[PDB]
Design a protein around this ligand. Sequence first.
Ligand SMILES: NC(=[NH2+])NCCC[C@H](N)C(=O)O
Length: 304
Amino acid sequence: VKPNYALKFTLAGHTKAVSSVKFSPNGEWLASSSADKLIKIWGAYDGKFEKTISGHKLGISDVAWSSDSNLLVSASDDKTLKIWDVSSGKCLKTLKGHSNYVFCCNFNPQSNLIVSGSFDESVRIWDVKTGKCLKTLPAHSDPVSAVHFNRDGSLIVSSSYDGLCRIWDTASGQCLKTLIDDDNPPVSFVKFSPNGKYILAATLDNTLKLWDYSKGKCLKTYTGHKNEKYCIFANFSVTGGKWIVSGSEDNLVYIWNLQTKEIVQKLQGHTDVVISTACHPTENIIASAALENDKTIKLWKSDC
Ligand SMILES: NC(=[NH2+])NCCC[C@H](N)C(=O)O
């Protein structure tokens, strides 16, 4: 079993590097963030441009959807996060507290909390309703590259250029696990698997690893791509075959068989680093996006 991802749509409109793309949980929309300071919304199935959401004073590094698909949160170089009502375009809250670039963000499944990571080396947990910072975690000793909640929101995983992945108890703020791998290369991305049992981590030595995070055992290693500089997103694809998907600094999207670790497809089309990929929640659809020399977003579809 290999997939047959093929290019269907190219989405042009951002005027600087794209930073992040994410599908809405309801499957209807794709949200994109950029160094051009904008968020754009696009149809998930047809790539049709929907609207621009503006307000940040500097470039945006990440964007994330609430579980009901009504809200977005964005993370900016302006040291803030913003919560947006997507339909109205309204900025509902500006989350203030970080003392340097906010790099990454996510809602919990309940979507009453937001987690953020920053160049200030901290992770913050925020109340969606009030915009108040509830906890500041002294998480890392270098910039925080990614933050993600597990399936029931009881855990947060964080990654950092300090070379560590840490697991945090959402309720207490306590550090529960530090994952250590030899030579401590910068960790440029991390997230939980959809079931919550594993985490997938990227390091800046051209390597992705699937970890059992309780046992601290590395179960799989994925290689063949290029990643030595940029914080590139990676994914589990679960709508068809069970794949791992990532961008790459050679301008390709890589797809691996999760079990065997073989590369099953490489998607050609982008003309600069593929910084971000996302997998549609119900259909075999991948979105990908590229840095400044390209600036486009691509939608790819497979029969499996
Ligand atoms: N959270 C992320 N991994 N965002 C994408 C990287 C964005 C970053 N500002 C860059 O251009 O390198």
